[PDB]
Design a protein around this ligand. Sequence first.
Ligand SMILES: NS(=O)(=O)c1cc2c(cc1Cl)N[C@H]([C@H]1C[C@H]3C=C[C@@H]1C3)NS2(=O)=O
Ligand SMILES: N[C@@H](CCC(=O)O)C(=O)O
Lengths: 49, 148, 50, 98, 96
Amino acid sequence: AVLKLSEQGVLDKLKNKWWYDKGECGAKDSGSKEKTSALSLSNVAGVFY
Amino acid sequence: VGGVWWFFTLIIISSYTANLAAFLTVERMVSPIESAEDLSKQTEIAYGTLDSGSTKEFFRRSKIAVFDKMWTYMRSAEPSVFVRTTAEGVARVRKSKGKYAYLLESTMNEYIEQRKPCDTMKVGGNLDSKGYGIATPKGSSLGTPVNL
Amino acid sequence: VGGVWWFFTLIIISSYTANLAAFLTVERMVSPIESAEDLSKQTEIAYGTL
Amino acid sequence: YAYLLESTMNEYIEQRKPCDTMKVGGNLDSKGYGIATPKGSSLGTPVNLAVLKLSEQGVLDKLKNKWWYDKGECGAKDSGSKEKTSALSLSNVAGVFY
Amino acid sequence: DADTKIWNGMVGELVYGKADIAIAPLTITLVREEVIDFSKPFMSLGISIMIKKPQKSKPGVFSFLDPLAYEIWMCIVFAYIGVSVVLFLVSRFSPY
Ligand SMILES: NS(=O)(=O)c1cc2c(cc1Cl)N[C@H]([C@H]1C[C@H]3C=C[C@@H]1C3)NS2(=O)=O
Ligand SMILES: N[C@@H](CCC(=O)O)C(=O)O
């Protein structure tokens, strides 16, 4: 009976369920998004040194 | 002293142009993820329908797994995401501060977006193709002369 | 000579300033080990199982 | 010579090679296909009930994906969302020399 | 109704014969076909999603000053002056 569900891939649908349909914390989602701008002095301050 | 200052002004304002080009690229606010599908996935923003609504009955009967999963949430949404009247859900979203979505119809969503203070937004397309029709008591004589 | 040298430096610094604000924000990573092998070697970080 | 036809036709033939058509503007009206019987037949209610299931089950859309969109053939439906080339040409430039 | 099928709302108005017609924003469904008759549909619609309008900020008058933060503009002027005076310092230094 195990071999049916593996062949029917229902485990994967469950594997999506208990790992990936509950992708909660952040960078799984926010890692593929856009960015901000407006350069800061901490990026610059060694040049003044 | 001068070549230092040359080296200074070479780095700085050339770097300015790189950021200056970056502002003229794009200004689109992303307005978070539509065709919602995260309402199935996230737990952050709730979402409800009208009480005694066909849509509230639709997801009870909807067999699409995400819609099932929404209905799985909507039956388990505690407290009631479901509302009794129309503007009940509207100002609920308006005070939700982006923490409660609400489902209604396309003709509603376009009309309330034309209302002041325009604080709504339709996202995505529709989900289906429905249609209002005039109803009679079943078996009345009025059916054909109305529908003609 | 300078006509070589100007043509030299023109193609250089233009390429230098192809992108720079992209290169000032990276904030990449540290990640000392992956395949640990220093857990055998160092005495600093311990490590256990269930 | 222009030609008038339907919206479902105009989108479908624009998906055909060599894409040489174009839909312009919107529609003019809101029409709708429906299944017709001989008038007064017994078949009316069992047909018209059975339509409402498949619409509610959206199987029509799956078929609408099938006969229009799973056979998206001609080009710019696919190539319109791709990348581009480079290497500026003199035809872009030649007015400056004038 | 649950388990007694009592159509509330506007449906039982025509099911139980209380009203004569229902010209209203009423969607044709499948289960409503079993209880009342309908016309041909007159206005198409669908399930929309309404959420808030999330508050875009407009550019300012000094929007060209924006791709450099407020401090560095103040910082560069400071550096601008002190560079110049040291040049002027070594400029006039008793040529013997
Ligand atoms: N564009 S709309 O939703 O307001 C709309 C929708 C519809 C209209 C007319 C309009 Cl204006 N008439 C059609 C009906 C006229 C005939 C053809 C289609 C049906 C029968 N019903 S519909 O397809 O539901
Ligand atoms: N016209 C719909 C509105 C509610 C819904 O879409 O669920 C009805 O009467 O059922």
